[PDB]
Amino acid sequence: ASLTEIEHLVQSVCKSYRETCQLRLEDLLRQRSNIFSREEVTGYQRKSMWEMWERCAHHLTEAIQYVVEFAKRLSGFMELCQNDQIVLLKAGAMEVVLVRMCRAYNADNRTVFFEGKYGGMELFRALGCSELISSIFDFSHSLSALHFSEDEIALYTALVLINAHRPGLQEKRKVEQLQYNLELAFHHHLCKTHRQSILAKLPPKGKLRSLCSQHVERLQIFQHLHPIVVQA
Amino acid sequence: PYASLTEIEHLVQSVCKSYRETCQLRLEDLLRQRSNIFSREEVTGYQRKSMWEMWERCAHHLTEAIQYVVEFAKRLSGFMELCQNDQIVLLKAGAMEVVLVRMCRAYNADNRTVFFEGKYGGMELFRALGCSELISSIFDFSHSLSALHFSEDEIALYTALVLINAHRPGLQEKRKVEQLQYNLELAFHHHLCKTHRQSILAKLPPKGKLRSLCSQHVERLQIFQHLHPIVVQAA
Ligand SMILES: C[C@H]1[C@H](C)CC[C@]2(C(=O)O)CC[C@]3(C)C(=CC[C@@H]4[C@@]5(C)CC[C@H](O)C(C)(C)[C@@H]5CC[C@]43C)[C@H]12
Numbered sequence: 401a402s403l404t405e406i407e408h409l410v411q412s413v414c415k416s417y418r419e420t421c422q423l424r425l426e427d428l429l430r431q432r433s434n435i436f437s438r439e440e441v442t443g444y445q446r447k448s449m450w451e452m453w454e455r456c457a458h459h460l461t462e463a464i465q466y467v468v469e470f471a472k473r474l475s476g477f478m479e480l481c482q483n484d485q486i487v488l489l490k491a492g493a494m495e496v497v498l499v500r501m502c503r504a505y506n507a508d509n510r511t512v513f514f515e516g517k518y519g520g521m522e523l524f525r526a527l528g529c530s531e532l533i534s535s536i537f538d539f540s541h542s543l544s545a546l547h548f549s550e551d552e553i554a555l556y557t558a559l560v561l562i563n564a565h566r567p568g569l570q571e572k573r574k575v576e577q578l579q580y581n582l583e584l585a586f587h588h589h590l591c592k593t594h595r596q597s598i599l600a601k602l603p604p605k606g607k608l609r610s611l612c613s614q615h616v617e618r619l620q621i622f623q624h625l626h627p628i629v630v631q632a
Numbered sequence: 633p634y635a636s637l638t639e640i641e642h643l644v645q646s647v648c649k650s651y652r653e654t655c656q657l658r659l660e661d662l663l664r665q666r667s668n669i670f671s672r673e674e675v676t677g678y679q680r681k682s683m684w685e686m687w688e689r690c691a692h693h694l695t696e697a698i699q700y701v702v703e704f705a706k707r708l709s710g711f712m713e714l715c716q717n718d719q720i721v722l723l724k725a726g727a728m729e730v731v732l733v734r735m736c737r738a739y740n741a742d743n744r745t746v747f748f749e750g751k752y753g754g755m756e757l758f759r760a761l762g763c764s765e766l767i768s769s770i771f772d773f774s775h776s777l778s779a780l781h782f783s784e785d786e787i788a789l790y791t792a793l794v795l796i797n798a799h800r801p802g803l804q805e806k807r808k809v810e811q812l813q814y815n816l817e818l819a820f821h822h823h824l825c826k827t828h829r830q831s832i833l834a835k836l837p838p839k840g841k842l843r844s845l846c847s848q849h850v851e852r853l854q855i856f857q858h859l860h861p862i863v864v865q866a867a
Pocket residue numbers: 421422423456457459460463497498500501503504512513514515524532533536615
């Protein structure tokens with residue numbers, strides 16, 4: 401495609417992101433000084449595994465709704481058939497949530513914004529999967545080190561989601577073409593803003609998939625269907 | 633392993649129990665409201681609404697009804713043993729089909745009205761949807777279902793088989809679904825036998841009828857930029 405087309409794709413992906421970013425970055429940043437006390441930590445830690453999983457499913461669900469609304473504003477995505485839309489969301493909506501997560505993560509003290517205050521990974525002890533949790537914290541930590549702008553997140557997440565490697569696609573060449581255009585958009589934007597250097601520092605592609613499918617598997621143990629599926 | 637009388641009886645109970653806990657609205661509450669009918673002015677207030685407003689309302693009722701159907705599925709212990717892919721295939725194909733069966737409970741065959749947003753109204757309430765043939769078709773279908781005079785337990789067992797259908801294309805563990813379907817069939821037939829209700833079997837909606845009605849609604853939702861309503865979307 402032309403320069404004008406690539407520019408228009410950059411603008412439309414960032415617009416769609418901006419409209420669906422769930423919480424404003426400034427609100428997340430302002431809250432950084434607001435940290436759970438030890439007593440509040442041990443209040444979280446003493447909760448039933450069932451209660452913590454319920455909370456964490458509910459945050460996952462709500463964050464995924466914003467990601468599906470992101471996908472719905474990418475005119476490329478609304479052109480795909482229904483099965484291919486489901487395939488991309490089922491594999492990618494939760495991966496996008498885990499990238500967006502880095503906005504709510506404070507690298508200075510290794511804490512995340514969770515339910516009104518920042519807390520460290522020990523807040524989630526009642527989840528009973530401390531290796532998974534610690535790895536999630538390492539992944540967000542590696543993302544924080546890139547210092548993403550809002551627009552880099554938009555462009556990077558569009559690529560996470562519009563992904564021709566997902567198994568089960570029916571219009572693979574079409575998804576490949578959309579993905580190709582989105583890579584051009586991302587690359588162009590980074591060159592224009594003197595930020596090409598991040599491309600070599602992005603996490604290995606399978607890392608994100610592995611972190612998500614371990615979450616999905618724990619949700620399944622706790623009787624929650626894939627969080628793309630409407631439940632209550 | 634061929635299920636005992638006790639095993640099949642226990643299956644009848646657990647399906648009816650799951651239904652009862654997720655039936656969304658109580659039958660009594662629906663029936664009591666039958667005397668409460670939209671006025672002509674209220675009807676034309678519906679009809680003047682934008683296509684986008686009425687599709688928003690109808691998508692919203694569909695979604696919420698599907699959530700109760702999904703919760704129905706999650707309580708069928710057979711269904712939680714299925715793999716993730718099969719769970720999706722069955723709900724994508726069957727959750728809204730269950731909704732269109734459950735709808736008959738909100739349908740009054742005496743005057744062909746449906747309970748919608750606090751009062752009963754005829755199909756003309758839905759004119760702004762711009763698919764009058766489809767809506768007329770849905771009313772005929774609910775009318776035909778109402779003739780059967782279903783009990784809640786019959787809706788429970790019928791709708792479990794709407795969902796657990798081993799012929800849905802794309803199933804990866806077809807054998808597992810066939811096993812579940814066969815027991816649900818025994819459970820439904822056993823219950824109908826015991827209550828002298830087997831005559832309803834020949835009268836159940838033809839193969840594909842439910843599917844065609846759901847696929848038409850999904851297509852219209854898709855025209856109005858709503859993905860398949862099994863997929864979580866703006867709250
Ligand atoms: C993605 C962001 C969003 C941009 C803003 C709101 C968000 C929220 O739901 O509050 C902030 C916290 C995390 C990171 C959000 C969603 C999911 C996670 C999650 C439940 C993800 C799985 C993890 O293992 C863990 C339990 C640590 C987090 C906690 C932070 C949460 C709950 C939301």
